Design an enzyme around this catalytic site. Structure first.
Site, PDB file in Angstrom:
ATOM      1  N   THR A  98       0.807  -1.207   0.000  1.00 23.29           N
ATOM      2  CA  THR A  98       0.000   0.000   0.000  1.00 23.29           C
ATOM      3  C   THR A  98       0.845   1.264   0.000  1.00 23.29           C
ATOM      4  O   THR A  98       0.766   2.061  -0.931  1.00 23.29           O
ATOM      5  CB  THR A  98      -0.991  -0.023   1.162  1.00 23.29           C
ATOM      6  OG1 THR A  98      -1.855  -1.145   0.978  1.00 23.29           O
ATOM      7  CG2 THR A  98      -1.834   1.244   1.191  1.00 23.29           C
ATOM      8  N   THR A 111      -3.347  -3.244  11.348  1.00 23.94           N
ATOM      9  CA  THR A 111      -2.677  -4.417  11.881  1.00 23.94           C
ATOM     10  C   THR A 111      -1.380  -3.885  12.467  1.00 23.94           C
ATOM     11  O   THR A 111      -0.617  -3.207  11.790  1.00 23.94           O
ATOM     12  CB  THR A 111      -2.351  -5.406  10.762  1.00 23.94           C
ATOM     13  OG1 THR A 111      -3.573  -5.831  10.153  1.00 23.94           O
ATOM     14  CG2 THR A 111      -1.604  -6.621  11.304  1.00 23.94           C
ATOM     15  N   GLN A 162      -5.298  -1.391  -3.726  1.00 29.56           N
ATOM     16  CA  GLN A 162      -4.999  -0.044  -3.258  1.00 29.56           C
ATOM     17  C   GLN A 162      -3.863   0.554  -4.087  1.00 29.56           C
ATOM     18  O   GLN A 162      -2.876  -0.111  -4.399  1.00 29.56           O
ATOM     19  CB  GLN A 162      -4.693  -0.004  -1.756  1.00 29.56           C
ATOM     20  CG  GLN A 162      -3.750  -1.055  -1.247  1.00 29.56           C
ATOM     21  CD  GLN A 162      -4.390  -2.430  -1.142  1.00 29.56           C
ATOM     22  OE1 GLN A 162      -4.137  -3.304  -1.966  1.00 29.56           O
ATOM     23  NE2 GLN A 162      -5.211  -2.629  -0.120  1.00 29.56           N
ATOM     24  N   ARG A 218     -18.510   2.990  -9.520  1.00 26.67           N
ATOM     25  CA  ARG A 218     -17.990   1.636  -9.496  1.00 26.67           C
ATOM     26  C   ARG A 218     -18.800   0.667 -10.336  1.00 26.67           C
ATOM     27  O   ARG A 218     -19.910   0.270  -9.974  1.00 26.67           O
ATOM     28  CB  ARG A 218     -17.774   1.170  -8.067  1.00 26.67           C
ATOM     29  CG  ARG A 218     -16.579   1.911  -7.510  1.00 26.67           C
ATOM     30  CD  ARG A 218     -15.946   1.259  -6.343  1.00 26.67           C
ATOM     31  NE  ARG A 218     -15.665  -0.146  -6.557  1.00 26.67           N
ATOM     32  CZ  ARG A 218     -15.563  -1.004  -5.553  1.00 26.67           C
ATOM     33  NH1 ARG A 218     -15.717  -0.560  -4.315  1.00 26.67           N
ATOM     34  NH2 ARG A 218     -15.349  -2.289  -5.778  1.00 26.67           N
ATOM     35  N   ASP A 247     -11.922   4.126   0.873  1.00 26.57           N
ATOM     36  CA  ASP A 247     -10.972   4.715   1.815  1.00 26.57           C
ATOM     37  C   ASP A 247     -10.018   5.689   1.119  1.00 26.57           C
ATOM     38  O   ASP A 247      -8.800   5.644   1.346  1.00 26.57           O
ATOM     39  CB  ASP A 247     -10.144   3.601   2.488  1.00 26.57           C
ATOM     40  CG  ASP A 247     -11.001   2.522   3.143  1.00 26.57           C
ATOM     41  OD1 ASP A 247     -12.194   2.753   3.425  1.00 26.57           O
ATOM     42  OD2 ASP A 247     -10.461   1.422   3.386  1.00 26.57           O
ATOM     43  N   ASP A 264      -7.776   4.022  -1.858  1.00 30.45           N
ATOM     44  CA  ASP A 264      -6.649   4.550  -1.077  1.00 30.45           C
ATOM     45  C   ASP A 264      -5.869   5.684  -1.735  1.00 30.45           C
ATOM     46  O   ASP A 264      -4.642   5.723  -1.649  1.00 30.45           O
ATOM     47  CB  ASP A 264      -5.681   3.413  -0.719  1.00 30.45           C
ATOM     48  CG  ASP A 264      -6.241   2.475   0.339  1.00 30.45           C
ATOM     49  OD1 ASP A 264      -7.472   2.467   0.558  1.00 30.45           O
ATOM     50  OD2 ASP A 264      -5.439   1.741   0.957  1.00 30.45           O
TER      51      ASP A 264
HETATM   52 CL   LIG Z   1      -4.331  -3.658   7.667  1.00 26.86          CL
END
Ligand SMILES: [Cl-]
Length: 342
Positions: free
Chosen positions: A85, A248, A129, A195, A175, A154
């Protein structure tokens, strides 16, 4: 008396100008004296990582001066690994007091063409992303005026310190503004995109996915802006204002969704078209490896005087009082930093 230390242009006849932005940047004397680069109109296919403090880019026009590259998190490098990302970013700000004005930054990853590929097509990417702009933890005081950020998933990754987006256009799907940074957006067009791969009754995307630590006073703050759809085909109630992203994270008891990344997204005096349905939840994995949902009502998701058909009709969308709203001035959000152009 605005002086350009360097000029980038597509002309090999424009004079003593640079051909690429990277070269112009590399011509800058070491240190932290201000360095200003005029970028003449053109599409510059470059990926930049800014490590020079006090660097400033000015395009000839937001419409014509473009920095673009196509990279998805799932795009593979030479060694066969994924960019990731952060790694997919067209521009990465890892220096202080950066500013970009009157230019466009795009991640040209063709998300729709990728989604349209057959599932057995081995070139169809899952990690879709594709960041256009990434302000890292080393990029405090990043200023973007009259800048356009283009992407789908992203688009804008803001992390670490403060960033200010003024009179900007940011487009995306999922996002498209995310991260833990203190990012203030004033007088911007936040463009929710069509989309083709999403059925009309499903969610097409989310404007924000803040990961703001609970102890951080300000996260994503959008003021005097316009939340719009790029086309009439963006369905009514297809976009969330925000979704709580708990990255995470590595802890002494394992690696999992950070419970304290209780993101903040606040809209004030911003219009919202009918594509907005409200806030949304987001799932991650907890310390046990179980699915966990982080809910909007548990996040710092607020509005103050939104208007337009997408504004709150129900009550599950918390509203700031006038007093609370006074806490979201540019002065308070940015603190000791007053964004200014060279
Ligand atoms: Cl994540």
């Amino acid at each position: 008396a605005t002086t350009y230390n360097a000029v980038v242009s597509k002309s090999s006849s424009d004079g003593k100008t640079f051909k690429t932005i990277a070269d112009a940047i590399a011509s800058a004397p070491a240190g932290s004296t201000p360095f200003v680069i005029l970028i003449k109109n053109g599409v510059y296919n470059e990926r930049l990582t800014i490590t020079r403090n006090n660097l400033h880019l000015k395009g000839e026009s937001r419409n014509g001066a473009v920095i673009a590259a196509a990279t998805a998190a799932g795009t593979l490098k030479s060694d066969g690994s994924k960019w990731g990302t952060a790694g997919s970013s067209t521009i990465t700000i890892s220096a202080k007091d950066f500013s970009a004005q009157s230019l466009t930054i795009r991640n040209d990853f063709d998300f729709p063409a990728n989604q349209a590929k057959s599932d057995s097509d081995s070139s169809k990417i899952k990690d879709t992303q594709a960041v256009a702009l990434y302000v890292t933890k080393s990029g405090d005081r990043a200023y973007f005026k009259d800048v356009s950020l283009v992407g789908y998933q992203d688009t804008l990754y803001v992390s670490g310190g403060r960033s200010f987006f003024s009179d900007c256009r940011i487009s995306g799907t999922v996002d498209f503004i995310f991260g833990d940074g203190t990012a203030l957006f004033n007088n911007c067009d936040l463009v929710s995109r069509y989309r083709a791969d999403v059925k009309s009754g499903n969610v097409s995307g989310y404007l924000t996915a803040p990961s703001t630590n609970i102890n951080q006073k300000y996260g994503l703050v959008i003021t005097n802006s316009r939340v719009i759809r790029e086309s009439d085909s963006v369905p009514a109630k297809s976009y969330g204002l925000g979704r709580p992203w708990h990255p995470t994270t590595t802890f002494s008891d394992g690696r999992y969704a950070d419970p304290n990344a209780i993101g903040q997204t606040v809209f004030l005096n911003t219009s919202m078209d009918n594509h907005i349905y409200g806030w949304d939840k987001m799932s991650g994995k907890d310390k046990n490896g179980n699915t966990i949902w982080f809910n909007p009502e548990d996040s710092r998701f607020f509005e103050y005087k939104s208007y337009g058909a997408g504004a709150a009709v129900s009550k599950d969308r918390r509203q700031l009082t006038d007093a609370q709203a006074a806490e979201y001035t540019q002065s308070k959000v940015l603190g000791d930093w007053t964004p200014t152009l060279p």
